[PDB]
Amino acid sequence: MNIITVTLNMEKYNFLGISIVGQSNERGDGGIYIGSIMKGGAVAADGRIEPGDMLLQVNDMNFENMSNDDAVRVLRDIVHKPGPIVLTVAKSGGSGNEVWIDGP
Structure with a gap:
């Protein structure tokens, strides 16, 4: 799988606008x-992230070792920080x- 890192424009778009599914903290979890x-939202307007993409990191935080509950808390905590x-x-x-x- 191709891995990409994208910088979102929160200042402009105001909310992230994603849901998450799954978990990654137990051995054998799928992610x-x-x-x-x-x-x-900021994710939609960027255009590169799609449903079904695997979330690996938010900023420096590792989402390949998190429960669903922990992931939701971290994301909600981050979206309200400058x-x-x-x-x-x-x-x-995808x-x-x-x-x-086009062009001239």
Whole structure:
């Protein structure tokens, strides 16, 4: 799987706008994944993250060793702190990278 790190524009978009599923803290767990992406949020507007992508890190925090409950708490704690939000994901879900339509 391709691994990508994306910097979200929280200042502009105001909310992250993702759900998560899964867990990663027990041996044998499959990981934490993006469930759905809400229109208008920072993740949606970036365009590269998709449902089914595997969530690996938020900032410096490792989401390959977290329960679902812990993941939700960490994410909610981070989204209300000033400072960057940067997500690292594995592309198990598909990226809609920026493509120019045309030009002069």
